[PDB]
Amino acid sequence: MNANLFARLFDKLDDPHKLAIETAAGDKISYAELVARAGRVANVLVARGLQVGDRVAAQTEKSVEALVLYLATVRAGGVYLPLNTAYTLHELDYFITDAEPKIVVCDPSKRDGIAAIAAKVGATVETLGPDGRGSLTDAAAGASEAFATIDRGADDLAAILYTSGTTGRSKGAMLSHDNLASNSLTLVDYWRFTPDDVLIHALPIYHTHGLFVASNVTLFARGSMIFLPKFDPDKILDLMARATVLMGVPTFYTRLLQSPRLTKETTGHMRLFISGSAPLLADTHREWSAKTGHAVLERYGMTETNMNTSNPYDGDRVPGAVGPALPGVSARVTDPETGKELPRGDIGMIEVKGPNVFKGYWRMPEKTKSEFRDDGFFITGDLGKIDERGYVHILGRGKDLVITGGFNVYPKEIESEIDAMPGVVESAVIGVPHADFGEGVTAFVVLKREFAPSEAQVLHGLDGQLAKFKMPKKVIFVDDLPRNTMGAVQKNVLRETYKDIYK
């Protein structure tokens, strides 16, 4: 009856000695051992001033100790607030001032600088390094394992995750215990996770994917994970011989496809490859199936909504689509302006509703109101369509739409045309200010080493395929596209760098 996520996970534990986590060093941690670790750390949090509802902010390198801190925070009735490991002291100041955590956990090498920030809000600072050592660990070594998991209701907060910051300054999403439990429980069934599953976990844990989807699904299912610090293709390829699931982002798949070790034989023990967090291109899906014989399962979620849709485990996994709405989740497509639902197949704003959807943005009630329809649907900001079979197709972010000379131009279809050309690795299409057209469609293209065409050849190639209003006004060759630490393209970086090209 306790809705606390920790209690949902562990209050009844039938097989306590089963493996939960293998660390990168090869240490093995049982379910019972994980629970006990979380008990010690929960007691530390209370000993360091945690009261129910208080935020615990964590910026640390990835380790099992860092995962335990998440579980312990939730267990103790706190609100877990992970922060991108790369955020500078200056950047952290915004998040700590916004969230006003009671406790901040950071890397030992940054304690002095973070202590000064923490002082502004009266927070206590503990440390945890990449080896799992630090003041938090010292405090936990003498703490009691026994901890009475705090009573929480379905709608009480478990975490605040800040969005990735792709379209603007990151916003804090308030996530409840039921948001997290309902979503992972649904996914366990939908993806047929069992106690026999072994997940290769190579994702960051400050993002919803690596933190909630990977960890909560595995732990509810009573499977295990192999907990790697970063993406390493050869290590991942090595582990596939003794694992069953990989959760990845599209860049995992494009990079693994460059390895000559990626074969049917190397992947033959694997049950399931999942992709999320950015668009898996249909060509990449097909390349994966051609090389390995596996059909990648793509799913779509956001910080604010957890997972909304998924390609079916036991049905057609459709290249370029993110699947139908998950059980319990409603998805529709609406006219961006009027908000009325569109006929199936028409392009508009994707909206979602369900127990997965967050409670709003932290201390931003006005912005929260503006992103919810009157009937409770959340406006995703993603444009797309739902086909006759109910599969959602994401055509792009609303923020990426380019208005030029009175026309709406959808960059994905221009990017598709360019990426189809021989000698092209990938492209990003944006608008930047243009005195004649409002915005000028501009294509940034990453070329292959040998087979590369010129600016003019690209435009000539597009001229035959594309209506005149959709044509890029210029093509710019770049060495790579800017991406965040999760692998998502950062089009605002290109918009800033190239803002004056038509001036």
Ligand X SMILES: Nc1ncnc2c1ncn2[C@@H]1O[C@H](COP(=O)(O)OP(=O)(O)OP(=O)(O)O)[C@@H](O)[C@H]1O
Q: Which amino acid is at 80?
A: Y
**Least Cβ distance, residue 263 to Mg ion (angstroms):** 37
164 marked as part of a ligand binding site: yes
Identify the residue whose tokens are 């703490």.
143
Q: Which does 59 bind (CB under 5 to 8 A by kind): Mg ion, ligand X, none?
A: none
263 marked as part of a ligand binding site: no
What string of DSSP letters covers 71-116? HHHHHTT-EEEE--TT--HHHHHHHHHHH--SEEEE-GGGHHHHHH
332 marked as part of a ligand binding site: no
**Least Cβ distance, residue 11 to ligand X (angstroms):** 30
207 marked as part of a ligand binding site: yes
> How many CB atoms lie under 10 A from the CB of residue 74?
28
What string of DSSP letters covers 8-44? HHHSS-S-TTSEEEEETT--EEEHHHHHHHHHHHHHH
137 marked as part of a ligand binding site: no
**Least Cβ distance, residue 464 to ligand X (angstroms):** 28
**Least Cβ distance, residue 351 to ligand X (angstroms):** 12
- Strands (E) across 172-261 are located at 172-176, 198-201, 224-227, 245-248
Residue among 137 and 163 whose Cβ is closer to Mg ion: 163
Q: Which does 10 bind (CB under 5 to 8 A by kind): Mg ion, ligand X, none?
A: none
Residues of this chain that bind ligand X (CB under 6 A):
163-168, 170, 276-279, 298, 300, 302-303, 322, 380, 382, 394, 397, 488
Half-sphere exposure in the Cβ direction for 42 (13 Å, CA): 24
165 marked as part of a ligand binding site: yes
If you count them, how many residues does the chain have? 503
208 marked as part of a ligand binding site: no
Residue among 137 and 306 whose Cβ is closer to ligand X: 306
**Least Cβ distance, residue 367 to Mg ion (angstroms):** 12
- Token digits for 404? 């030029």
What is the DSSP code (8-state) at residue 361? B
What is d(CA 402, CA 45) in angstroms, rounded to the nearest whole number? Answer: 48
Distance in Å from the first CA to the final CA of the chain: 63
Q: Which stretch binds Mg ion (CB under 5 A): 116-124, 155-163, 272-280, 385-393?
A: 155-163
Adjacency order of strands within the sheet including 474-477: 424-434, 438-447, 474-477
Helix (H) or strand (E) holding 298: strand 297-302
What is d(CA 90, CA 99) in angstroms, rounded to the nearest whole number? Answer: 15
Q: Which amino acid is at 458?
A: V
Residue among 163 and 334 whose Cβ is closer to Mg ion: 163
Residue among 300 and 377 whose Cβ is closer to ligand X: 300
Q: Which does 78 bind (CB under 5 to 8 A by kind): Mg ion, ligand X, none?
A: none
What is the DSSP code (8-state) at residue 86? T
**Least Cβ distance, residue 181 to Mg ion (angstroms):** 23
Residue among 208 and 215 whose Cβ is closer to Mg ion: 208
Q: Which of residues 157-216 bind Mg ion (CB under 5 A)?
A: 163
166 marked as part of a ligand binding site: yes
What residues line the site for Mg ion (CB under 5 A)? 163
Q: Which residues are part of a known binding site for ATP? A: 163-167, 207, 277, 298-299, 303, 382, 397
Extract the annotated binding site: 163-167, 207, 277, 298-299, 303, 382, 397
